[PDB]
Amino acid sequence: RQIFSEHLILESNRQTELESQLRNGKLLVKDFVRGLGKSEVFRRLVLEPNTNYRFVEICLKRFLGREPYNKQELIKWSIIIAEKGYHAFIDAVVDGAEYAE
Amino acid sequence: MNDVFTRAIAQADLKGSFLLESDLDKLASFAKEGVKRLDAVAALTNNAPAIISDAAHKLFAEQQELIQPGGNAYPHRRMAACLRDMEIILRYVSYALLAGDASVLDDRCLNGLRETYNALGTPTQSVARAVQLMKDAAMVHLKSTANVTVGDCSSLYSEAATYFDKAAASIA
Amino acid sequence: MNDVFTRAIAQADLKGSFLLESDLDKLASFAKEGVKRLDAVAALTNNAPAIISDAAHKLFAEQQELIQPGGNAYPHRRMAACLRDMEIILRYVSYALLAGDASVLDDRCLNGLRETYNALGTPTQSVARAVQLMKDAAMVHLKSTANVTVGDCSSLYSEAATYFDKAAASIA
Amino acid sequence: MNDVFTRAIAQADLKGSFLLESDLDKLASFAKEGVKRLDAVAALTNNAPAIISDAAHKLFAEQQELIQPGGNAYPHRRMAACLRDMEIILRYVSYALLAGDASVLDDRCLNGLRETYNALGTPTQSVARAVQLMKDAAMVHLKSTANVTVGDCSSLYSEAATYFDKAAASIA
Amino acid sequence: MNDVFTRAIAQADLKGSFLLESDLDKLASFAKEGVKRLDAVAALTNNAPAIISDAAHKLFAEQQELIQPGGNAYPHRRMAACLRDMEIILRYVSYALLAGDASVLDDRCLNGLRETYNALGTPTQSVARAVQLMKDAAMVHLKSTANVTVGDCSSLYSEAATYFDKAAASIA
Amino acid sequence: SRTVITEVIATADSQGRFLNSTELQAAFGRFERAVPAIEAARALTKNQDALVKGAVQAVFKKFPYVTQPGEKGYGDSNQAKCARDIGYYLRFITYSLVASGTGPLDDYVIAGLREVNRAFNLNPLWYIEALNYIKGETGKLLSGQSKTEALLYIDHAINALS
Amino acid sequence: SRTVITEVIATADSQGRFLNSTELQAAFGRFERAVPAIEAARALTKNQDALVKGAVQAVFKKFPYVTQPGEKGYGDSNQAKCARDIGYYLRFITYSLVASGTGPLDDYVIAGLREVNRAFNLNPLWYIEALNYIKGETGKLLSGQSKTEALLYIDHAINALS
Amino acid sequence: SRTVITEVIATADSQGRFLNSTELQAAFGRFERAVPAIEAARALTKNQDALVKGAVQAVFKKFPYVTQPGEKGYGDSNQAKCARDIGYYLRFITYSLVASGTGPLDDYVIAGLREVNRAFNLNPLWYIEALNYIKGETGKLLSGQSKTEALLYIDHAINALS
Amino acid sequence: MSRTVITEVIATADSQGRFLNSTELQAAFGRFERAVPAIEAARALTKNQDALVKGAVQAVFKKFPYVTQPGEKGYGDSNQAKCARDIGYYLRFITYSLVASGTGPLDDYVIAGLREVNRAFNLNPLWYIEALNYIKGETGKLLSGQSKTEALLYIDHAINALS
Amino acid sequence: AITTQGKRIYKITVSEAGAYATNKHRTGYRAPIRQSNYTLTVPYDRFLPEMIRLHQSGAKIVNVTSVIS
Ligand SMILES: CCC1=C(C)/C(=C/C2=NC(=C\c3[nH]c(/C=C4\NC(=O)[C@H](C)[C@H]4CC)c(C)c3CCC(=O)O)/C(CCC(=O)O)=C2C)NC1=O
Ligand SMILES: CCC1=C(C)/C(=C/C2=NC(=C\c3[nH]c(/C=C4\NC(=O)[C@H](C)[C@H]4CC)c(C)c3CCC(=O)O)/C(CCC(=O)O)=C2C)NC1=O
Ligand SMILES: CCC1=C(C)/C(=C/C2=NC(=C\c3[nH]c(/C=C4\NC(=O)[C@H](C)[C@H]4CC)c(C)c3CCC(=O)O)/C(CCC(=O)O)=C2C)NC1=O
Ligand SMILES: CCC1=C(C)/C(=C/C2=NC(=C\c3[nH]c(/C=C4\NC(=O)[C@H](C)[C@H]4CC)c(C)c3CCC(=O)O)/C(CCC(=O)O)=C2C)NC1=O
Ligand SMILES: CCC1=C(C)/C(=C/C2=NC(=C\c3[nH]c(/C=C4\NC(=O)[C@H](C)[C@H]4CC)c(C)c3CCC(=O)O)/C(CCC(=O)O)=C2C)NC1=O
Ligand SMILES: CCC1=C(C)/C(=C/C2=NC(=C\c3[nH]c(/C=C4\NC(=O)[C@H](C)[C@H]4CC)c(C)c3CCC(=O)O)/C(CCC(=O)O)=C2C)NC1=O
Ligand SMILES: CCC1=C(C)/C(=C/C2=NC(=C\c3[nH]c(/C=C4\NC(=O)[C@H](C)[C@H]4CC)c(C)c3CCC(=O)O)/C(CCC(=O)O)=C2C)NC1=O
Ligand SMILES: CCC1=C(C)/C(=C/C2=NC(=C\c3[nH]c(/C=C4\NC(=O)[C@H](C)[C@H]4CC)c(C)c3CCC(=O)O)/C(CCC(=O)O)=C2C)NC1=O
Ligand SMILES: CCC1=C(C)/C(=C/C2=NC(=C\c3[nH]c(/C=C4\NC(=O)[C@H](C)[C@H]4CC)c(C)c3CCC(=O)O)/C(CCC(=O)O)=C2C)NC1=O
Ligand SMILES: CCC1=C(C)/C(=C/C2=NC(=C\c3[nH]c(/C=C4\NC(=O)[C@H](C)[C@H]4CC)c(C)c3CCC(=O)O)/C(CCC(=O)O)=C2C)NC1=O
Ligand SMILES: CCC1=C(C)/C(=C/C2=NC(=C\c3[nH]c(/C=C4\NC(=O)[C@H](C)[C@H]4CC)c(C)c3CCC(=O)O)/C(CCC(=O)O)=C2C)NC1=O
Ligand SMILES: CCC1=C(C)/C(=C/C2=NC(=C\c3[nH]c(/C=C4\NC(=O)[C@H](C)[C@H]4CC)c(C)c3CCC(=O)O)/C(CCC(=O)O)=C2C)NC1=O
């Protein structure tokens, strides 16, 4: 619900590998969140419709829990996507200082 | 993200009907020329450093005010950002050339880029000029007859020109 | 996680020299049979729920104490867990059969499954029995010549047998 | 993390039968005396800070080596940590009191606290002694019947003694 | 993660008394030659790539089994790890030199390096010989009296040699 | 949707790299397989009416009781919706054939299938029976390789339902 | 123990690069300046006992009910351990003066100050007064750089108290 | 390492699903390029001995100043290192052609390339033009599918170098 | 937005949500003492800018003869001019860093994006390393005592980042 | 993570003994406190950053094992 927004909670969207790893205890919550971000459903349902900047806004609201400070933050974050993939964007967000704090 | 096949499928589904035999024939012709399309895409991919370097040299010969102190490409970070932007746009053009539809290029690259450049103070006309220079330096490479079978790739050349012009018109 | 071709390449790298001609012919002979291996893996995938259903029916016909209260697969969630384990075992075995290398199956699926069942109290012999039941069902579905051309695939069936046997022995 | 009702249901499911009328009778006997248990737990909760202050004062009194430098309880932050440990173990005993089962005690922290205190180096018999003496201090408050209607409280005292001593024996 | 001054204060806390004036004299002398050790640390940081390059060159010259296929640093990304590890080790040694205590060295990654190199299969004797090689190179680099004022620094050299040898003995 | 080309491009775009040789090999495989798939799509498009009507009738045969009063199959409207749904499944199978990927099915049909079937109490077994009928008649209508493609997609739909 | 040089090492270790100029030259400021700080540490060592007693009776003075029976002040051994605690605080002041940083103070005494204060009904105001008294003495005992060395740590201690 | 079917299994494993029409079509397109890439690797392995010498000589031709003393190119052991580098590149190109994917060349050469070339002070343009010479000579050794596979892989290595 | 002593102090105080403690103002005092040799060095280095740049250009050409012949990067009057301009840039940012008492000007204006620009334009880092080594040699004479060390720290930092 | 290096996961046994406890007592607890010893599985790509985080955070690791190979 925090990542996929409760309307994508469908049996087709259900990451079962991540869930089983979590249930084992071999997966951290940070890694479960990251794996949900780095998933086909998150790219196809969230990244593809939106531009890099609106996708950054969504990811800041959902992963950090806070809306972007201004449009310049959208701009500075969108370059990670544009140049290294939204996988590198998600890794930067979830392995950042703010998420860890 | 759409290619030609998914574009046809989506339009047919909006009409709520199967694909007509004309549409299937069009897609068959597309698939038949797909090998030439792959050749052009590989030419663009393998020559990305050459294309970017030539476009940069030409652009900074034409527009010296970029590389002057107080210009928009003056320090090393700004020059590296310039070259990075050119590489990214070339990447999305090659994606759109493989797919056959400019939907990926417009959706993922150009959809809000002019607003970004205005917010950054970047001359959008200079970015468009760099994109046209990459067009020239690329069609130099797409037309390289050597090492491949000879044939009529005029349609692919027109398609690549349209994608580059779409990029330039979107940024500026 | 490798395919057999990567195994040969890595061995060549370890011994420093190129691939011998014997190795190259072995790899080419495997590869020309690849369009013949695709039908086998497609037969495993297209019939996967049927294989799982029949294997579960036979497995729970053989042993009732599991379904019985106090048994390992008595609670409804634990029955679902049983079903999902059979599913994943079959899926990763099909992965390995396609790859022609059994290392993927050990590296990603079978690495710590035995220890997981040791920690969870599940009898490993029952999982081995389930894997062998899926062995039988998979062979049945693989032999079906309907909708495919006739041919001699003894290598494929024997390889699938070895893969399922290794998985079953690994679990217990 | 189990309740007396939860434990009864667990055994009933294990034997596969319904809940026997004797088990229901004992659950009803427990439930009719619920306000007993709630008043004890609530008084313990309300008077916990005074209990912990008294416990700290005495454990400083009889045990002296800690308070001077070099002991496993000199520093001020280490004092905050010790107060937190005594508070949380008192709270866990309160949990076991309300639930009526020690599984809420044994499973959660007692398992790991053993190796934790072995690794830290702080003596465990001192911890058990502090548990017993804080039990006495809390029991003194638990006697207080004022502001509340009078009644019997022996069974709750026996259960609390069992749980405190169980925690001490686990730690020791 | 404790400085020599912090370490001395830690023993003062352990004794629970003040710092004796003799220890104060030692610490004042340490802060007096702090200029000298800062120059040493600057000479270590500024010439870090040169030291690492010389150490790598002669380490690979002396031991050929690593570069060759199947060697611990053959795949051309394992040498990435080799050079990165050597740089990290010299960063830690510079940290220790500035702090004047090995506690900052022990706390961060001396404990884990041994077991990580055990798990990876990296031989520790090669790493230790590399540490001696960087020790010799850094000794030579810091000996350079040019561009700096002349003075007595044998104490610093002994400290640095002890730190490098201690790191190598820890990994080996 | 999700085709070979789209997976290639999206995988490149998620690592932020240019399309390299392996991606172009996959695209080449798609472009070579396009001919049998388009042939299969044309075959299933020509005979859509016979396939849909026969599938509906096979569904009714397997479950006669559904067409009884008070059940889902009674009434002209419900059987018209039956024919409509089988037409949807056939349309998306042909779309997946042309696209050379299960993307059209995974997006249009399979995404949200369980929720919708459980909400309207539609038995998946009806649709599996209809798809099995389509599977059977594809063998007659299609020979050789286009049959294999159509069967791959119909099997994917069936496994999605069951 | 977050001392300035150790903080340098940490804030470089979290990153992948060596100690740059700012770090080295801040260490240089410390290495020049340590002499007045350690001088003030030894000076406060020489005057420990007088500061201990004087602060004890100063806190006795401005808050009279402590002198009154029925409070924490009442009790001979109580007052003895009160003097022991103020001696702890002066020892930590000397520790911080030696360390050229606020690390030793925050390591032991400030860390979890409010929790222990509440648990033992020892509000910070009494210690605030004691440290104001000790600051008044350090105002006359030490002059020059060492005066500032004493005053800054005394102020950090009182700010942590308040 | 990585191949085409390796990427297929990786994608399917990530999505937690069985191999579909897209993935098996990619595997088919990979197995169709099996034997032409095999013959390309065969041809490059046959001639390697002349290519390595020609490559180091073309390197010296492109950078005459390197050969003179006081530079990297001067020294017989340096000559052997040049030959070994060229042999490594050609060997991994053959491995990649056998594997039908740029994986072995990615993990055996490209991974860690820039920082090694910087740390050992090896100029990448040397290898860029050495691979350019190897490209020129593969232009004549082979023709057909094998030649274009060799061209793609060599060009990928070249773009990696720059 | 540079990373200087004062600004690193302010940033590490802000991140912890606290006022500037003793040690922060303490390091700031160290910096304000540092500044006098730094400004002296920057003055002595900005006065001699043209001779330094000229000597650096000539030294680079001497150490790299091959760049001078036809068909290379160094052939041509325009490439001469851009060599002089690049070395002037490096010198100007070294003086900036001296004044600011930090590597912020160099790390932001020159170092960040250095490798990408060099690679794209096929510029060899060794040219600028030799130019900066010449500048180091000359500022060995131009500067005395503290100022020489302060200038050499930043020239060494630039050289290390070039390598 | 597809390559051979993305393989070969590693298990790490971590204890949060007093070196971690001091720094966390200074900084403070944002979350409830857990047991000292735990087994944490990390891939090779994240192996180095994870150990850097563990060492900087002040924890002491008990034993490192190669789960794969
Ligand atoms: C922030 C500071 C800064 C630096 C350092 C900088 C370096 C720099 N030098 C450039 C041109 C150049 N610079 C040189 C330098 C060479 N000339 C030869 O005489 C020497 C051997 C050698 C110098 C030692 C050359 C050859 C070029 C032309 C490269 C080309 O365009 O192909 C360019 C490309 C802009 C153009 O085409 O004019 C940059 C970005 N730019 C900056 O904004
Ligand atoms: C995939 C879609 C996409 C693209 C392409 C994109 C480009 C982009 N260009 C940027 C800045 C920039 N872009 C340029 C390039 C321009 N200025 C020069 O003069 C040239 C004339 C011209 C290039 C030909 C420069 C110099 C900057 C730096 C601005 C700055 O750092 O202040 C930035 C933000 C700054 C950063 O984080 O580094 C982005 C995000 N963003 C996107 O979401
Ligand atoms: C592994 C990745 C891959 C590559 C590298 C590739 C190249 C490639 N190009 C081919 C034919 C061709 N290639 C071209 C393209 C050329 N025409 C002009 O000369 C242009 C310079 C240039 C494109 C802009 C043409 C026109 C054909 C023949 C088309 C036909 O016969 O149908 C063929 C088939 C050989 C044949 O038709 O006899 C291949 C394999 N295909 C791939 O799947
Ligand atoms: C990497 C791929 C992967 C595999 C292979 C996998 C298997 C797996 N099955 C599990 C549970 C389980 N699995 C079973 C299966 C047994 N029941 C018996 O009927 C059968 C003989 C046997 C099935 C073959 C049971 C009973 C449990 C629950 C055990 C318990 O709760 O105590 C668990 C524990 C974690 C969880 O389910 O949340 C794993 C990891 N999980 C994965 O992510
Ligand atoms: C899109 C996915 C895809 C599949 C599924 C595929 C399979 C495939 N199987 C083929 C023939 C064959 N298929 C098989 C396999 C079957 N023979 C026996 O009945 C066994 C029961 C069974 C093996 C388990 C065999 C043995 C051949 C003949 C081998 C040959 O072509 O020489 C052929 C070549 C002739 C044709 O069908 O047009 C293909 C392309 N290719 C693909 O691109
Ligand atoms: C899961 C619930 C939980 C438990 C079980 C728990 C016990 C516990 N006590 C600890 C250390 C400690 N334990 C004690 C208490 C001992 N020393 C003396 O005072 C006494 C003899 C004795 C108490 C009666 C002290 C003082 C420390 C601090 C050690 C240090 O900071 O170095 C630690 C190490 C990490 C930390 O303190 O944050 C734990 C986990 N804490 C919890 O959050
Ligand atoms: C806000 C939460 C809450 C509390 C605090 C609570 C206390 C509480 N206990 C009651 C009954 C009672 N409660 C007790 C228990 C007391 N007898 C003594 O031994 C001890 C001081 C203590 C047990 C440790 C007794 C003896 C009764 C009379 C009913 C009976 O047990 O027969 C009553 C009903 C008063 C009446 O009889 O008219 C209340 C309000 N009830 C609540 O819902
Ligand atoms: C911020 C970094 C830093 C710099 C820039 C620096 C330069 C420097 N060197 C100095 C003296 C000195 N410099 C050294 C350096 C040693 N002498 C030998 O030649 C060795 C090769 C060499 C290093 C091991 C020594 C031993 C002294 C005299 C120490 C003393 O008398 O206290 C002084 C104090 C004298 C004055 O005020 O003019 C400074 C400022 N020192 C530093 O810590
Ligand atoms: C915080 C700092 C820290 C370090 C540096 C550390 C050591 C370390 N070395 C590693 C691999 C490696 N390290 C080396 C280097 C050694 N092997 C020999 O050949 C060289 C002479 C020698 C250089 C000192 C090599 C070759 C590997 C690759 C082994 C492999 O691929 O598994 C790895 C695996 C992570 C990765 O490579 O991405 C670690 C964590 N652990 C730490 O927590
Ligand atoms: C993307 C493709 C797609 C499909 C496949 C689809 C199926 C579908 N069929 C529906 C109605 C229905 N569909 C049927 C089908 C039954 N009729 C006969 O009896 C057979 C036994 C059986 C068919 C094999 C029936 C009975 C209803 C009416 C159910 C109701 O109104 O509650 C509905 C409810 C919405 C409405 O029409 O009001 C859906 C969503 N919808 C879609 O958008
Ligand atoms: C070095 C680490 C450390 C610190 C920081 C520390 C503070 C501290 N002071 C305490 C008691 C005390 N603190 C004071 C001081 C205050 N009370 C009166 O109101 C005075 C007016 C006022 C003095 C200005 C007194 C008098 C006590 C004795 C209370 C008692 O135990 O009876 C206690 C209770 C346990 C004990 O020490 O016996 C602690 C933990 N203790 C430590 O081991
Ligand atoms: C399997 C992956 C792999 C690659 C790619 C590889 C290249 C390579 N060649 C090296 C040595 C070297 N290689 C050369 C050759 C270059 N310099 C000139 O002679 C020529 C123009 C040019 C050759 C075209 C030289 C000179 C050295 C010595 C390093 C030095 O002098 O600084 C080194 C440094 C370690 C050593 O071998 O001693 C590497 C990493 N080694 C590998 O294990």
Side-chain angles (χ1 to χ4, degrees), chain D residues 38-52 90 94 141-142:
Chain D
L38 279 171
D39 287 331
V41 184
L44 192 155
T45 288
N46 291 289
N47 296 115
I51 300 158
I52 303 154
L90 176 79
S94 81
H141 264 272
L142 264 294

Side-chain angles (χ1 to χ4, degrees), chain D:
Chain D
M1 281 85 88
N2 289 2
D3 190 354
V4 298
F5 313 88
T6 289
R7 268 279 162 81
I9 296 154
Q11 272 43 240
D13 210 322
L14 167 59
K15 74 181 171 272
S17 302
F18 287 60
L19 258 184
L20 272 300
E21 301 67 20
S22 183
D23 307 333
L24 302 168
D25 278 323
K26 77 173 55 64
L27 307 164
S29 301
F30 180 85
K32 66 182 290 294
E33 292 310 313
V35 63
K36 299 288 94 176
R37 182 164 307 276
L38 279 171
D39 287 331
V41 184
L44 192 155
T45 288
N46 291 289
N47 296 115
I51 300 158
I52 303 154
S53 195
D54 191 1
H57 284 64
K58 44 161 175 65
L59 63 84
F60 296 147
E62 68 269 11
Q63 273 273 50
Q64 173 45 10
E65 181 285 340
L66 303 194
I67 195 176
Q68 42 270 20
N72 312 292
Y74 181 76
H76 185 94
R77 50 156 196 97
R78 195 179 295 270
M79 287 323 88
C82 192
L83 293 189
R84 169 221 65 186
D85 291 331
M86 64 184 73
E87 181 146 320
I88 62 170
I89 191 166
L90 176 79
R91 189 180 35 95
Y92 273 136
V93 176
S94 81
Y95 293 135
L97 205 64
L98 178 55
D101 190 11
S103 84
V104 298
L105 174 71
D106 301 5
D107 295 0
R108 266 291 193 193
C109 71
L110 277 296
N111 295 130
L113 194 40
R114 294 310 310 102
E115 51 275 20
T116 290
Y117 283 162
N118 296 115
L120 175 55
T122 298
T124 186
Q125 69 276 17
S126 299
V127 188
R129 188 270 299 164
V131 176
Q132 309 153 11
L133 289 190
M134 182 179 72
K135 159 193 64 181
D136 300 332
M139 171 56 158
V140 161
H141 264 272
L142 264 294
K143 312 319 299 313
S144 158
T145 300
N147 287 266
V148 186
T149 304
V150 176
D152 52 351
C153 305
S154 63
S155 296
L156 289 185
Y157 298 152
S158 54
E159 190 164 293
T162 61
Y163 287 156
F164 273 120
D165 291 29
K166 155 156 289 184
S170 179
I171 294 301

Side-chain angles (χ1 to χ4, degrees), chain B residues 53 56-57 60 64 67-69 74-80 83, chain I residues 85 89-90 92-93 108-114 116-117 120-121:
Chain B
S53 81
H57 284 125
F60 297 121
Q64 277 260 10
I67 62 170
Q68 308 269 27
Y74 159 54
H76 274 126
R77 49 191 192 84
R78 260 175 202 124
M79 190 56 108
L83 312 164
Chain I
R85 182 214 54 186
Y89 284 160
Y90 272 93
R92 188 176 90 224
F93 294 122
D108 283 318
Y109 293 171
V110 160
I111 300 321
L114 184 65
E116 290 88 296
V117 172
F121 293 88

